[PDB]
Design an enzyme around this catalytic site. Structure first.
Site, PDB file in Angstrom:
ATOM      1  CE1 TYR A   1     -19.493  68.531-136.629  1.00  0.00           C
ATOM      2  CE2 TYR A   1     -20.630  68.667-138.149  1.00  0.00           C
ATOM      3  CZ  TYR A   1     -19.695  69.526-137.270  1.00  0.00           C
ATOM      4  OH  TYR A   1     -20.255  70.504-136.655  1.00  0.00           O
TER       5      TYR A   1
ATOM      6  CE1 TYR B   1     -27.485  65.803-131.460  1.00  0.00           C
ATOM      7  CE2 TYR B   1     -25.568  68.012-131.841  1.00  0.00           C
ATOM      8  CZ  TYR B   1     -26.119  66.284-131.371  1.00  0.00           C
ATOM      9  OH  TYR B   1     -25.018  65.713-130.689  1.00  0.00           O
TER      10      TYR B   1
ATOM     11  CD  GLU C   1     -22.104  66.091-129.862  1.00  0.00           C
ATOM     12  OE1 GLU C   1     -21.180  66.591-129.923  1.00  0.00           O
ATOM     13  OE2 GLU C   1     -22.657  66.923-130.191  1.00  0.00           O
TER      14      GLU C   1
ATOM     15  NE  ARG D   1     -18.187  66.220-131.408  1.00  0.00           N
ATOM     16  CZ  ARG D   1     -18.783  65.766-132.726  1.00  0.00           C
ATOM     17  NH1 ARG D   1     -18.071  66.058-133.820  1.00  0.00           N
ATOM     18  NH2 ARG D   1     -20.088  65.841-132.493  1.00  0.00           N
TER      19      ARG D   1
END
EC number: 3.2.2.22
Length: 262
Positions: free
Chosen positions: A72, A123, A176, A179
């Site tokens: 993160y 988000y 994102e 990952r």
């Protein structure tokens, strides 16, 4: 803490692919892997952080700080005025970690300036500030990233909609993508234009934790209980073995204890 440099302002798809594999290599734990998938470290492995320096067009830069453990974004920094480093910690970073985002993103005292992000990294938050119902309505793309760097880096005042829109595009394009191999290829497939996040890119983002736990807990490649998911059209997608979903995933969140390695 190591910092990975990538030039947004002038790139090709390989240059994007190399960056990402340097982020994954650098972030992952040196020995853990479940089913040939690299796993992120426990909180205790040092270094604790990776820095991602993004070079935009017109000498604009943003350095992104990330946690290895769960990739993160803790916050970002930009060059400001002559010699200042301006650090921006997300509202939901606390304790030592806050001194740690300061100290790591802006390593020299005397030059530090604070400008916090007054909202958290989830988000639903970032979407309220962009003033959009769903990230999906905001387009992603390399030129969108460059241009957003340019709305934030070294600007005296910038508005929450502007900031949330930068972070929606950069978290999706950097953490994102790293990952998920699937999201990386969505970005390769549209490299020369802007594109809207499809339901699967969004669904993969929101279920990573559950995916990591399923894969770790799987015996003989069979998942513990079927993992309902959503595909690129919106259709319920139900996977049962690790081989179904593994094409789409590059890094696993940490779950401790053993699992089939290779």
């Amino acid at each position: 803490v190591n910092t990975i440099i990538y030039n947004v302002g002038s790139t090709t798809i390989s240059k994007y692919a190399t960056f990402l594999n340097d982020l994954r290599n650098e972030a992952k734990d040196p020995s853990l892997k479940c089913y040939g998938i690299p796993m992120l470290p426990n909180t205790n492995t040092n270094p604790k952080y990776v820095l991602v320096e993004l070079q935009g067009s017109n000498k604009k830069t943003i350095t992104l700080m990330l946690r290895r453990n769960n990739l993160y974004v803790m916050g970002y920094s930009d060059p400001f005025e002559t010699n200042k480093c301006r650090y921006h910690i997300f509202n939901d970073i606390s304790g030592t970690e806050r001194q740690d985002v300061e100290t790591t993103l802006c390593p020299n005292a005397n030059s530090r300036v604070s400008k916090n992000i007054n909202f958290d990294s989830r988000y639903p938050t970032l979407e309220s500030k962009a003033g959009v119902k769903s990230r999906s309505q905001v387009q992603l793309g390399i030129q969108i990233l460059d241009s957003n760097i340019g709305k934030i880096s070294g600007v005296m005042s910038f508005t929450e909609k502007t900031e949330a829109e930068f972070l929606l595009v950069a978290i999706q394009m950097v953490s994102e993508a790293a990952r998920f191999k699937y999201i990386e290829n969505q970005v390769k497939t549209n490299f020369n234009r802007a594109f809207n996040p499809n339901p699967k890119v969004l669904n993969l983002q929101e279920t990573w934790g559950k995916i990591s736990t399923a894969i770790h807990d799987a015996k003989n490649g069979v998942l513990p209980k079927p993992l309902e998911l959503v595909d690129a059209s919106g259709a319920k997608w139900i996977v049962l073995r690790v081989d179904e979903i593994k094409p789409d995933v590059a890094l696993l969140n940490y779950v401790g204890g053993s699992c089939q390695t290779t």
